[PDB]
Write an enzyme that holds these catalytic residues in place. Structure first.
Site, PDB file in Angstrom:
ATOM      1  CD  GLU A  11      75.177  47.118  41.069  1.00  0.00           C
ATOM      2  OE1 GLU A  11      74.645  47.685  41.985  1.00  0.00           O
ATOM      3  OE2 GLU A  11      75.899  47.752  40.185  1.00  0.00           O
ATOM      4  CG  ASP A  20      79.132  54.412  39.518  1.00  0.00           C
ATOM      5  OD1 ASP A  20      78.934  54.278  40.715  1.00  0.00           O
ATOM      6  OD2 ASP A  20      79.090  55.564  38.982  1.00  0.00           O
ATOM      7  CG  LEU A  32      82.785  53.323  44.687  1.00  0.00           C
ATOM      8  CD1 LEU A  32      82.534  54.011  43.351  1.00  0.00           C
ATOM      9  CD2 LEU A  32      82.102  54.124  45.752  1.00  0.00           C
ATOM     10  CG  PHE A 104      75.247  45.839  46.658  1.00  0.00           C
ATOM     11  CD1 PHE A 104      75.446  46.315  45.371  1.00  0.00           C
ATOM     12  CD2 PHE A 104      76.076  44.787  47.107  1.00  0.00           C
ATOM     13  CE1 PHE A 104      76.485  45.840  44.576  1.00  0.00           C
ATOM     14  CE2 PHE A 104      77.093  44.284  46.302  1.00  0.00           C
ATOM     15  CZ  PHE A 104      77.322  44.817  45.044  1.00  0.00           C
ATOM     16  CB  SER A 117      60.341  54.345  52.057  1.00  0.00           C
ATOM     17  OG  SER A 117      60.309  55.408  51.165  1.00  0.00           O
ATOM     18  CG  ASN A 132      57.640  57.702  50.617  1.00  0.00           C
ATOM     19  OD1 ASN A 132      58.825  57.526  51.010  1.00  0.00           O
ATOM     20  ND2 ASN A 132      57.064  58.867  50.755  1.00  0.00           N
TER      21      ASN A 132
END
Length: 164
Positions: A11, A20, A32, A104, A117, A132
């Site tokens: 990040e 972002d 965020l 996250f 998945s 996948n």
């Protein structure tokens, strides 16, 4: 390596409001603030989150505090979600970090949407799940980060980050 170091690599750290990859107002280590287009709405959420008048800027300390809260909330969210907890409990320590990273970034709801998945991971079919997971908007939009996470689930090692 640990969850904190991993997310810090993915990040980044920014002490001023920024947009972002999706164009949303963010600050710190991927925190965020709002999906709203108003920088004003963002500055307001920011002050509410920190408990002071920030004027769009925070210290390192404040960033790390938000980060501690977000990681904690990510973990607690997995443990509270039926779908998620079951996968989490089945996984080894490193792979657990990969699922937290996804949560996250994309929220519980988002990750819980990866039905197939998740089933594959639970079954420990590493290669299949990796293939996948790559069939997603997620992978097409942030491919370098997605590949790092995907490798982590595939191998169960920190190789993708030992570079970085």
């Amino acid at each position: 390596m640990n969850i904190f170091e991993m997310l810090r690599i993915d990040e980044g750290l920014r002490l001023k409001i920024y947009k972002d990859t999706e164009g949303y107002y963010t600050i710190g280590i991927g925190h965020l603030l709002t999906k709203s287009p108003s920088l004003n709405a963002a500055k307001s959420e920011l002050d509410k989150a920190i408990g002071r008048n920030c004027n769009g800027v925070i210290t390192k300390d404040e960033a790390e505090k938000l980060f501690n809260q977000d990681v904690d909330a990510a973990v607690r969210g997995i443990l509270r979600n039926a779908k998620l907890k079951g996968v989490y409990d089945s996984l080894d320590a490193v792979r657990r970090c990969a699922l937290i990273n996804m949560v996250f970034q994309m929220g519980e709801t988002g990750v819980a949407g990866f039905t197939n998945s998740l089933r594959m991971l639970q079954q420990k079919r590493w290669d299949e799940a990796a293939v996948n997971l790559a069939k997603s908007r997620w992978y097409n939009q942030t491919p370098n980060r997605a590949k790092r996470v995907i490798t982590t689930f595939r191998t169960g090692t920190w190789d993708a980050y030992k570079n970085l």
